[PDB]
Every structure is written in structure tokens, then in C-alpha cells.
Design a protein around this ligand. Sequence first.
Ligand SMILES: CC(=N)N1CCC(Oc2ccc(N(Cc3ccc4ccc(C(=N)N)cc4c3)S(=O)(=O)CC(=O)O)cc2)CC1
Ligand SMILES: [Ca+2]
Length: 223
Amino acid sequence: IVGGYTCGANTVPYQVSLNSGYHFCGGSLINSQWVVSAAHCYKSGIQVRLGEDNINVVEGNEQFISASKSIVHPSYNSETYNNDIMLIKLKSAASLNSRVASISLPTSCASAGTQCLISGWGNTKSSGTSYPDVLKCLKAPILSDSSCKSASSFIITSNMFCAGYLEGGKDACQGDSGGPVVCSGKLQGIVSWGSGCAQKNKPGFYTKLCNYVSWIKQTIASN
Ligand SMILES: CC(=N)N1CCC(Oc2ccc(N(Cc3ccc4ccc(C(=N)N)cc4c3)S(=O)(=O)CC(=O)O)cc2)CC1
Ligand SMILES: [Ca+2]
């Protein structure tokens, strides 16, 4: 997260760190046994880390739980990033409390202009790299489809939205991948991709989670 702020320990209780020996992606706890993340974060040997603030220090509220199953969206396209969403089932249910909490799935898509909270342990620099150990947060408005389209050399789909600030300086970044974009208490987005980080006219792109609610509920129900 570039140009954001330190969230505060466990102020984003649905935020998860996916760990394969090191933090590699964020994700969002959507119930006691399931995490949603980006399909581009897929890899084997995932441990889900809940209750994290400082990902390098055991501070007493973590729950570490290995994934028993990952399910990349059936139509995830890694070339176009279409359908960049993955579900991860935990080997055992997380214990939910104030510091570990699920985030609600949306029932309606969010509209342009809506302010959202994006969080993660991704790179904090627009040029070069510095990775924070505590969770970073950024409030960013969803941008219009027209400006998202104008802002990207890549084909954008209806399963993506962009959010951020065209003037640059504030954006998600590498390492925030898979993490939540929450708008009005609903998980509306997943950190998906961007061209560089926090560059002028290059806003972050996010998987439009409201489009996947049926797949998500059906997949969880059947697994
Ligand atoms: C839309 C599309 N067709 N895509 C997505 C973009 C591109 O794929 C990628 C995927 C990953 C990267 N990486 C950077 C990267 C990764 C994740 C991000 C998440 C958000 C944001 C943002 N600003 N909100 C920028 C990000 C930039 S990379 O793999 O780490 C390159 C490397 O190895 O150093 C760079 C390009 C090509 C495929
Ligand atoms: Ca910790």
C-alpha cells in the first residue's frame, strides 16, 4: 500500500496474510472456514494467518491455519486477469472474536465515487521497494468505468473495477494482492493488478467481488 496509513493492530479483523514461509498475498476471511483471495495468488502450501498486525512478530492474537483446499475460479484467465478470485478453505475453523472476524459479502455492486478501504502488507513505495511489517490501509474511491478504461492499456472487464487516485501517490501494490477492498462494510473487491504502483493515471484494479457471490456461496456450500 503506497501513500496509505498504518491501520492499527487488528482494526481490519477480516484481513488475512497468506504465508508460504513468508507473507505473499492478502486475503479476506468471509467465514470461519473460508478465505477469499486472488487467483493470481494461487500456490500450494498456503498457511492462512489471521489476527495479524505485525507479520514478523508474534503479538498474541494470531491464528495460523493451513489451507486444506484452494479453488481458483473456474474461468480465471491469468493472461487477462479476468475472474481473479480464489477460495481457500481452512483445515479448521478460525475462532471468531473482535480481532478475527469475517467480512460480509456484498448484495449489490458498489458504484463509482464510493469510498473503500484497501489494506495489506504490500510495498509502500511508488518507486523502489519497502515492505511494512504492520498492516497498511488506504481509503480510495471507486473510479468510473470510463476512467478505468482510459487509464489502462489492458483489456478491462466487467469483473474488474478500478479504484484510487489518478494523480498518483496512493494505491495498492505488490504484496497487497488478494487483499480486501471493503466499501460500506461489504467486501466489494480483491486487490488484483495495476500498472506499477501509485503512478499517475494508473489506478489499481480490483476483482469485482459482487459478480462472484453466487459462485462463492455455492462453492462454499458444496465444499
Ligand atoms: C490486466 C492484465 N492483463 N494483467 C495484469 C497486469 C499484468 O500482470 C502483472 C502481474 C504482476 C505484476 N507484478 C507487480 C504487481 C503485482 C501486484 C500488484 C497489485 C496491485 C497493484 C496496484 N498498483 N494496484 C500493482 C501490482 C503490481 S509482479 O509480478 O510482482 C512483477 C515482478 O515480478 O516484479 C506486474 C504485472 C499483465 C496481466
Ligand atoms: Ca504477528
